[PDB]
Amino acid sequence: TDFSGYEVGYDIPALPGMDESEIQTPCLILDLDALERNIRKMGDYAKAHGMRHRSHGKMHKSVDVQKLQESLGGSVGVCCQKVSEAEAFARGGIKDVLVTNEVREPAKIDRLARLPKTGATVTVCVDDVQNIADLSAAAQKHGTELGIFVEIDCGAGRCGVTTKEAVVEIAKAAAAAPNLTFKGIQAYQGAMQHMDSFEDRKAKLDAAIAQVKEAVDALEAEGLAPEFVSGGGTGSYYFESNSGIYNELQCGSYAFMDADYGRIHDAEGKRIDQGEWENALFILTSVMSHAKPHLAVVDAGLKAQSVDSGLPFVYGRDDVKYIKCSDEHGVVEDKDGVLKVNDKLRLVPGHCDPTCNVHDWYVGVRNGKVETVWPVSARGKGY
Amino acid sequence: KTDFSGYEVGYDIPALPGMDESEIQTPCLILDLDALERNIRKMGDYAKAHGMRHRSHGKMHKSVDVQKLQESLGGSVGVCCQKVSEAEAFARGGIKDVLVTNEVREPAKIDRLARLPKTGATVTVCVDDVQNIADLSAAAQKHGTELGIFVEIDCGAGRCGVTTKEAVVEIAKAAAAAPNLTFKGIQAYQGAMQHMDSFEDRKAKLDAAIAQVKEAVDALEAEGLAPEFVSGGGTGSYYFESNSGIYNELQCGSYAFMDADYGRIHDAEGKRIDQGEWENALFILTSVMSHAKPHLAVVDAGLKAQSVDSGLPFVYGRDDVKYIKCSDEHGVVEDKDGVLKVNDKLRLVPGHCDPTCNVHDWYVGVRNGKVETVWPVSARGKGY
Ligand SMILES: *Cc1c(COP(=O)(O)O)cnc(C)c1O
Ligand SMILES: *Cc1c(COP(=O)(O)O)cnc(C)c1O
Ligand SMILES: [Mg+2]
Ligand SMILES: [Mg+2]
């Protein structure tokens, strides 16, 4: 780990060995103990249910976190939303990459078809039979093999096909196409993941499972039984795991957590951040103005995070409240005037994935010290 | 100059100079260089016609190259920066006059601030707490540099700054007395009113801010601390500061690029300011990557390619399709006529330019269908 050329407080927030009080704000810290407990717990859950877990790299965009998910959580590989992101993971040594998305632009397809030359195994999703010919041609050009998932729109309304006939058509084309292998089904119900009610989420996944089952049966009737039936997120994984239809999970956010996931309820009606998953990702911020008696202004505003899923909150205390932000300022209510200039706070971000994607580093803290500083390997890699 | 050898199109840069616009990799940010230059000239000409300095705000674009264009074509007198690390990026890029339009309190940040004049930059910083003066002076003394001081007034935005003329005078006196500091004037930015729809509502808010600033100027003058600069103003207010007789420096930022949330506010003729006053120069370029449903297209620019803090982007230059939804790596475009095909490209006007610029590392400057420039977002992610 050589950080030569970097400058703390200019292009990196900290270096291994620093005390946490020396970290430059605003930045992202990882509670390494809690991260590791989250990773172990999901890996144990998947194993106990006979499920593969392909950890989702779109969330943290970090080769180092993915390697920890593989070593400590038994993750079988990484999921990626974009080809450039996939390539960042493959260049970092990740050996099994699933692009949980469609790739259609010719230069993107060419880059995808080259990726296996890194030594990584590569699978991609398809929702348009016309895409098969392009992928096959590119794989033939580079002398590579690509795996194919057919993506089913099982309720999220994004990409994917909506009938079992469409699924069979794409799978048949994949099987017949040179240098492609039909590997199974992508069916991620992303739209239901943040419903507060466990029973509501169960009902949505019940419907997805029934649709996926019709597709599995149609494929089996054609001699194209899907090796993998892959999906599931931090708000649903128990349902895919109990289904006997899915055999691979794609959970991402559980490792870090955020406020929007944290507030949804488990089967007992308890917030999932109050027992199921721990907060491991925080924005560290400093108070930099307090001219009014009961308002503190901190240095983490919009550009240090996102607000697509609401505001962050101050972690570990309930006497102050993050209520507003502009681009480079956050306004924290301080009704008892207990915050002072240069005090530090930890914020749980509203939404982990976009927050991670506006930073270049994670400061991994343990026992009050900076133990690791990990690059956000795939930040901004949306091509 | 930029060295592109470390980068790779389609992996960590969207394009290279000389490419055809059809070859640009999506999602990315493009700048219509003609429109950008017309916006920059127009603001510069407006400022000069009103005898105002314009200090272009670098927090918006975070680009040394755009700032240099604002100086060369718009007559910008210098840059505004919101954070010390952003200021360091601009000073290291050769920008000669840097105002940090924010307070700097953390000791290591102050130490970094105090070294910035060694780049050749003149450096000014804002103060809203008299106790900050001693820390700034100590660092400047330690490193043999000079720092200028603006006292920040909360003139209605309710962010940083002080709210009494007595507090202003106290800070200014301390700056004047402190070694290696010089009291340079007032920071008074009414950011909260900038996006009110009604020009009349905006005028009234700035009337109140001007009155408060004038009282502070009067109090300073009575103490022998007349402010050399009285600086503020944004893209939604600049005509008020420019006709106030009190402000002498503007800090407009967004006008150069524009976005949807600014574009929708109305001018004194009841028109959207993006329908006459300022042109759209910043676009998100995006490709259709799925069309499995007959009347929906999915594009490759979602939340991670922009922001939604100020609402959705919109499709520019056509009326037959509509960006209605986005997830992290997808945008959903209504296509009720079924005219969009996979790999078609669309230009989106971002909802909010500043946060959108801060999630990308490059601007693809296009002119006459070609990539003329590829400029780095010099200060992306520099929030320290
Ligand atoms: C983002 C994503 C996941 C992981 O989702 P979480 O809700 O973050 O756990 C899984 N599958 C796909 C296809 C995704 O896009
Ligand atoms: C952002 C900002 C400006 C410029 O704002 P626009 O509304 O984008 O033109 C000016 N002054 C300060 C202090 C700012 O923070
Ligand atoms: Mg998410
Ligand atoms: Mg703005």
UniProtKB/Swiss-Prot annotation, chain A:
Effect of deleting the gene: Abolishes growth on glycolate or glyoxylate, but the deletion mutant strain is still able to grow on acetate, succinate or glucose with comparable growth rates as for the wild type.
GO molecular function, one term: oxo-acid-lyase activity
Modified residues (N6-(pyridoxal phosphate)lysine): 58
Needed cofactors: pyridoxal 5'-phosphate; Mg(2+)
Induction description: Induced by glycolate.
InterPro entries: Ala_racemase_N, D-amino_acid_metab_enzyme, D-ser_dehydrat-like_dom, D-ser_dehydrat-like_sf, HdxyAspAldBhcC, PLP-binding_barrel
One Pfam entry name: Ala_racemase_N
Residues that hold Mg(2+) according to the record: 351, 353
SUPFAM superfamilies documented for this protein: PLP-binding barrel
UniProt entry keywords in alphabetical sequence: Lyase, Magnesium, Metal-binding, Pyridoxal phosphate
Keyword Metal-binding found: yes
This enzyme's EC code(s): 4.1.3.41
Gene Ontology terms describing biological process: D-serine catabolic process; glycolate catabolic process; glyoxylate catabolic process
Highest taxon of source: Bacteria
Keyword Transmembrane: no
Catalytic reactions of this protein: (3S)-3-hydroxy-D-aspartate = glyoxylate + glycine; (3R)-3-hydroxy-D-aspartate = glyoxylate + glycine
Residues given in the record as pyridoxal 5'-phosphate binding sites: 81, 234, 252-253, 261
Bound cofactor: record note: Binds 1 pyridoxal phosphate per subunit.
Functional summary from the UniProt entry: Catalyzes the condensation of glyoxylate and glycine into (2R,3S)-beta-hydroxyaspartate ((3S)-3-hydroxy-D-aspartate). Is essential for the growth of P.denitrificans in the presence of glycolate and glyoxylate since it functions in glyoxylate assimilation via the beta-hydroxyaspartate cycle (BHAC). Is also able to catalyze the reverse reaction in vitro, i.e. the cleavage of (3S)-3-hydroxy-D-aspartate, and that of D-threonine to a lesser extent.
Self-association state and partner proteins as the record states: Homodimer.
Additional observations: The beta-hydroxyaspartate cycle (BHAC) consists of BhcA, BhcB, BhcC, and BhcD enzyme activities. Overall, it converts two molecules of glyoxylate (C2) into oxaloacetate (C4) without the loss of carbon as CO2, under consumption of just one reducing equivalent and regeneration of the catalytic amino donor, which makes it one of the most efficient glyoxylate assimilation pathways.
Protein family (similarity comment): Belongs to the DSD1 family.
Protein's name according to its UniProt entry: 3-hydroxy-D-aspartate aldolase
Native source species: Paracoccus denitrificans (strain Pd 1222)
Lineage: Bacteria, Pseudomonadati, Pseudomonadota, Alphaproteobacteria, Rhodobacterales
Gene this chain is encoded by: bhcC
